[PDB]
Design a protein around this ligand. Sequence first.
Ligand SMILES: *[C@@H]1O[C@H](CO)[C@@H](O[C@@H]2O[C@H](CO)[C@@H](O[C@@H]3O[C@H](CO[C@H]4O[C@H](CO)[C@@H](O)[C@H](O)[C@@H]4O)[C@@H](O)[C@H](O[C@H]4O[C@H](CO)[C@@H](O)[C@H](O)[C@@H]4O)[C@@H]3O)[C@H](O)[C@H]2NC(C)=O)[C@H](O)[C@H]1NC(C)=O
Ligand SMILES: *[C@@H]1O[C@H](CO)[C@@H](O[C@@H]2O[C@H](CO)[C@@H](O[C@@H]3O[C@H](CO)[C@@H](O)[C@H](O)[C@@H]3O)[C@H](O)[C@H]2NC(C)=O)[C@H](O)[C@H]1NC(C)=O
Ligand SMILES: *[C@@H]1O[C@H](CO)[C@@H](O[C@@H]2O[C@H](CO)[C@@H](O[C@@H]3O[C@H](CO)[C@@H](O)[C@H](O)[C@@H]3O)[C@H](O)[C@H]2NC(C)=O)[C@H](O)[C@H]1NC(C)=O
Ligand SMILES: *[C@@H]1O[C@H](CO)[C@@H](O[C@@H]2O[C@H](CO)[C@@H](O[C@@H]3O[C@H](CO)[C@@H](O)[C@H](O)[C@@H]3O)[C@H](O)[C@H]2NC(C)=O)[C@H](O)[C@H]1NC(C)=O
Ligand SMILES: *[C@@H]1O[C@H](CO)[C@@H](O[C@@H]2O[C@H](CO)[C@@H](O)[C@H](O)[C@H]2NC(C)=O)[C@H](O)[C@H]1NC(C)=O
Ligand SMILES: *[C@@H]1O[C@H](CO)[C@@H](O)[C@H](O)[C@H]1NC(C)=O
Ligand SMILES: *[C@@H]1O[C@H](CO)[C@@H](O)[C@H](O)[C@H]1NC(C)=O
Ligand SMILES: *[C@@H]1O[C@H](CO)[C@@H](O)[C@H](O)[C@H]1NC(C)=O
Lengths: 453, 53, 132, 132, 102, 129, 118
Amino acid sequence: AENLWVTVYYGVPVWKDAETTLFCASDAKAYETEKHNVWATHACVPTDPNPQEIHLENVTEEFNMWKNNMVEQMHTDIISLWDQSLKPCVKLTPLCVTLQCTNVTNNITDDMRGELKNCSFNMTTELRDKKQKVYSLFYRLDVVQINSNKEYRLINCNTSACTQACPKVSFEPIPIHYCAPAGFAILKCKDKKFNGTGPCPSVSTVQCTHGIKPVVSTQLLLNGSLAEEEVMIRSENITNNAKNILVQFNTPVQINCTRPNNNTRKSIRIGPGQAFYATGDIIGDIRQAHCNVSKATWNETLGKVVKQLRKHFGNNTIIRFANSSGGDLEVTTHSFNCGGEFFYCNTSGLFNSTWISNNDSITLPCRIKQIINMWQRIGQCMYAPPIQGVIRCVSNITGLILTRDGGSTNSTTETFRPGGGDMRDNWRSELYKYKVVKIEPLGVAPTRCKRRV
Amino acid sequence: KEYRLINCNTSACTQACPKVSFEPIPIHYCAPAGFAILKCKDKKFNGTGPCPS
Amino acid sequence: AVGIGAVFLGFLGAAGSTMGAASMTLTVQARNLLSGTVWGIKQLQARVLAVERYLRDQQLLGIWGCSGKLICCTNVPWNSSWSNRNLSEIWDNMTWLQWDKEISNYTQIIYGLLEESQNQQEKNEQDLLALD
Amino acid sequence: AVGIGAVFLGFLGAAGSTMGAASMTLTVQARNLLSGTVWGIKQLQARVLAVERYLRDQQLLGIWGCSGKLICCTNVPWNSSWSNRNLSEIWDNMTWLQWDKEISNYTQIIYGLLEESQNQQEKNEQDLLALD
Amino acid sequence: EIVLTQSPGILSLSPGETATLFCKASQGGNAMTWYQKRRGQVPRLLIYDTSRRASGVPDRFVGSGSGTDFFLTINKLDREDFAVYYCQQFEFFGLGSELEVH
Amino acid sequence: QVQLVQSGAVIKTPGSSVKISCRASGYNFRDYSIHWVRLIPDKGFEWIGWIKPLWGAVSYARQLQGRVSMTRQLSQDPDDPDWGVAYMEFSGLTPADTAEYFCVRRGSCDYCGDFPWQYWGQGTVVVVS
Amino acid sequence: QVQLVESGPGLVRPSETLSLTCAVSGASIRTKAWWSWIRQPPGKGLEWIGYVSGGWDLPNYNPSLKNRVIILKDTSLNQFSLRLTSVTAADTALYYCAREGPEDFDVWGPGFLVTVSS
Ligand SMILES: *[C@@H]1O[C@H](CO)[C@@H](O[C@@H]2O[C@H](CO)[C@@H](O[C@@H]3O[C@H](CO[C@H]4O[C@H](CO)[C@@H](O)[C@H](O)[C@@H]4O)[C@@H](O)[C@H](O[C@H]4O[C@H](CO)[C@@H](O)[C@H](O)[C@@H]4O)[C@@H]3O)[C@H](O)[C@H]2NC(C)=O)[C@H](O)[C@H]1NC(C)=O
Ligand SMILES: *[C@@H]1O[C@H](CO)[C@@H](O[C@@H]2O[C@H](CO)[C@@H](O[C@@H]3O[C@H](CO)[C@@H](O)[C@H](O)[C@@H]3O)[C@H](O)[C@H]2NC(C)=O)[C@H](O)[C@H]1NC(C)=O
Ligand SMILES: *[C@@H]1O[C@H](CO)[C@@H](O[C@@H]2O[C@H](CO)[C@@H](O[C@@H]3O[C@H](CO)[C@@H](O)[C@H](O)[C@@H]3O)[C@H](O)[C@H]2NC(C)=O)[C@H](O)[C@H]1NC(C)=O
Ligand SMILES: *[C@@H]1O[C@H](CO)[C@@H](O[C@@H]2O[C@H](CO)[C@@H](O[C@@H]3O[C@H](CO)[C@@H](O)[C@H](O)[C@@H]3O)[C@H](O)[C@H]2NC(C)=O)[C@H](O)[C@H]1NC(C)=O
Ligand SMILES: *[C@@H]1O[C@H](CO)[C@@H](O[C@@H]2O[C@H](CO)[C@@H](O)[C@H](O)[C@H]2NC(C)=O)[C@H](O)[C@H]1NC(C)=O
Ligand SMILES: *[C@@H]1O[C@H](CO)[C@@H](O)[C@H](O)[C@H]1NC(C)=O
Ligand SMILES: *[C@@H]1O[C@H](CO)[C@@H](O)[C@H](O)[C@H]1NC(C)=O
Ligand SMILES: *[C@@H]1O[C@H](CO)[C@@H](O)[C@H](O)[C@H]1NC(C)=O
């Protein structure tokens, strides 16, 4: 009996932490729409419906969303997919030209400048010999004054060429399910109260993740997965201030956003089979794009996050908010893509509050850039086509991305400012539950059996 | 006295990127699975014939 | 739980239970190891990495005593310095994760012992079938 | 040399020695057969060619008497016209290269004989387990 | 905030000896950064993560400590190592331990 | 190598402003943050603020808000994507502000945080009189 | 051109686990070679402890070493380590890492005196 032999057991359930590639999966309802008016349901496998969310019991795994993988892979996949949906579309190289711009026909005061500038310019037709004179509308944030007369040019025309987006492919998010390949499994921490780091006492394995719709937002991340009961803040280190603070709250705050300026698109032929989509007439009043939120629900959710943030900073602590301290445009405001057009909306109305230890609606004005340079590359800019009609959208605000100021010198107050920063902090708000492990079979173990000859 | 470039009536030209440099880094060649690379380690060997070592 | 009494459920379900209970459910963790214009390269390298890992495991088994027996007694003994615990305690007391944490050091010597034992059994069987 | 006495070293090390000495070292040449934006196609076709060759060899073995026994006595006899040399001389006198040069002609008939022998053994075992 | 305290202040030693510089935090459970700054020069990192050394740091520097109490041990004191030494926690700095030639 | 070249020393009148340029070279500037620190004599170090150049997101110290402003200039060309320039503008100068200012970058290792500043500029002396 | 350099203690207490580690440069570890440990008590002859191989040989030691010697190779760091559990003060010896090849132990280590003392 004490003459112990060894035995190999193949298919032993045991895993290790690993970092491998992943597996795209899209729902078949987005596959029902023909010719991919959203990106890549052909570059992504159809999701098998209701897959195996088999529970695991008496199992303690340590999760770490901050040093997590697959959020880097999601960032790389979305970047490469955004690049791969532009190579069919038309380059706007001949549009870099001297623009004769004036103000739009409007009873403008001298104080408030016109946001829209009308611009007429030469443009090549389909025929190489004949050029035409054509006009359009642009925003202040897309033209600069090259240098009596007043003549402009586009902003990107001395750093990079621009690619006009195809009006077929829309940027609205379809949900992406991530799946592990063979020999790997995705452990989902199903704990209710879980601050992103440490042992999760109630995990469950899975083959495919939930629907992760890729939204693009800097502050006030949109349509994410809200928490179960409480309002959970997450940080890599709360005492550190260089790391952001991902706030995920329970009740989603309804936001309404609209451009009320009615637009008419206009097809200008750059060349043979080259269509450019300019802005024609402003049918109706010239108004300003804006976003609304409910005053009472926003005050209530700020009370909830104050009640939760006082846990990490003591009870008798004053907590106040401020707006963004500065920088580039798309980190001061909060930016998003509503209906296939980009909004950059001011957030000073949402963060002027202080909090002591004891039917209206907030409107906030936006600005609309027609060109974008997201992810801040060296040589790419996307032109966006103007869309018809008055444009509105309703969304569920899910979480914030906050940042503590570097408070020293014995202050009771600790202020918070919304900071966008990297885009990965969006996906880290939706990949905190999951991790990827590699199954290793063929464990070995001593027992009392000897192989006979 | 007016000139042109030499290549402008046979082909277009691609300017090299000043990022990528043409200095050689050493390339090691390796066989895949199921193949092996025999190196003739003979001192005196004129390239053709039996290599005894 | 639901699988109490008739102790089975889906794969990695026994991973929380003790290794004695988990030993009866090994066919599915063996099963869910093979089956499951530039993204095709990612799909393909995932699939061939899966079959390469599976073929490496089947070749590591095949050079030992068991081709596909999935439970193999063999002829190498066990150094009691490695386990240094009560034998029947570990099948009612330990998970496979904790056991793999225990014998993390004592690895890769066992495999050479298995290869030596299998080659010795092969030469003994060759001699036995030779003199007959 | 260094591996004198305990006759082993790395793979293809026994390739110079006689086939009797090389027969004790076969596990590593079996081992070093599987493991090891347009160049990924070259890497992938190399990897799948390697696993295709390994699977063809394992299937050629599996239709014979031995799945993974790696040394297989079998039931087909040997025509002495093929070897036509002294039996114990070749295990102390010949390399595997020279032996493969010797029986280059006498190939591909042996494999059909092996398949006939294995199918005959299978139908005999089917009859034996049938009448019992 | 975090109050940091450099307890030896001025330390008077001779070359070839060993030295131990203590720092004390106001809040435990964190990392610690040790900086060397010679006279009239650029400061230079020595210890991050309370036990690790940077590039070009000789291993005679040993950072240690836990909780609120951290040590910096410099064995085999060269003449060059007589400098000011600072501790860092996330933004707050100790006022500096000055190493003096005796 | 990682190089942080500052501008030369300066003598400014009280109440005026000053702008210090920190030119970084030898790494991808769109990745690592840039911190600004000061050294006042007989006061030790004092951190000012950090700036992430990918969108220029800044954060200033609490006792210095309203008086400082940090900008950046990226490199927009596909041939030299590495170099970049941070700018710290310090306004409302007092005689207490006579000090030496530094721009710093963190290390590049795994367990390196953000505040263990590995690479340091040469320093810039600012005298108010 | 091969260069072997030992590293580890030279002064340990008896009844403990001794372990050295020899770094290898100038060549590769996975060669036709036995990376070996050989010792020598002071004033006396040599004493071959054992070896390990860069191929797939099982390591074979001197049976006088009483199965307390585990030489472990580290191909990812070009090293190979001696072990000696339950040492005595009579095990004081110069230790040597070496390389058996087609010639007999060409490149040694310098050899360091491990003086086991209590
Ligand atoms: C995000 O949203 C916030 C919230 O609105 C914006 O904050 C406001 O920004 C403006 C300017 O950017 C602030 O400035 C105000 O401008 C008004 C118009 O200026 C005219 O009048 C002044 C004389 O007062 C002239 O010098 C000037 O040339 C113009 O002719 C002023 O009327 C405002 O003065 C206020 O304060 C004085 C104090 O004495 C009062 O007497 C006035 O009656 C008046 O109340 C002021 O100068 C404005 O203060 C900001 N709002 C708030 C609530 O503070 C952000 O700008 C926006 N973000 C972005 C990027 O735009
Ligand atoms: C579109 O293309 C037309 C055709 O070239 C451009 O018109 C030309 O613009 C130049 C530059 O201003 C004019 O030259 C100047 O004209 C003025 C007025 O005649 C004259 O006083 C100056 O001495 C100088 O000659 C040129 O006449 C004009 N030609 C025509 C037919 O209008 C035009 O500028 C382009 N852009 C737009 C927005 O139309
Ligand atoms: C965050 O909120 C503060 C207010 O609490 C904003 O400060 C305000 O900033 C604007 C411009 O950024 C200042 O406007 C000034 O207007 C005159 C009018 O011509 C102009 O000449 C000046 O150059 C300046 O633009 C305004 O004075 C200032 N408010 C105060 C009280 O000083 C800050 O901009 C907000 N940040 C963001 C990102 O929205
Ligand atoms: C900061 O938060 C509050 C939103 O609750 C806003 O503060 C408002 O600031 C304006 C400044 O003109 C105040 O208007 C005037 O204030 C004087 C008192 O100084 C008052 O006597 C006048 O009748 C007039 O209302 C306004 O009262 C004040 N709001 C409150 C509730 O006191 C402000 O919108 C936020 N700041 C930013 C930059 O958004
Ligand atoms: C955002 O817009 C939606 C538009 O549907 C508003 O929802 C409606 O609000 C009215 C006013 O209370 C109700 O009578 C309707 O029943 C609501 N309809 C739906 C479908 O919800 C919403 O109130 C707006 N929110 C804010 C903050 O302005
Ligand atoms: C939020 O609601 C409470 C309760 O009425 C009120 O006391 C508080 O002032 C509100 N906050 C703001 C910013 O209006
Ligand atoms: C495994 O070996 C390491 C030395 O590399 C040792 O520190 C550790 O204690 C060993 N594990 C066990 C369970 O003893
Ligand atoms: C093999 O067959 C060829 C004819 O194809 C013959 O010339 C050769 O001699 C044969 N080999 C031997 C070893 O006899």
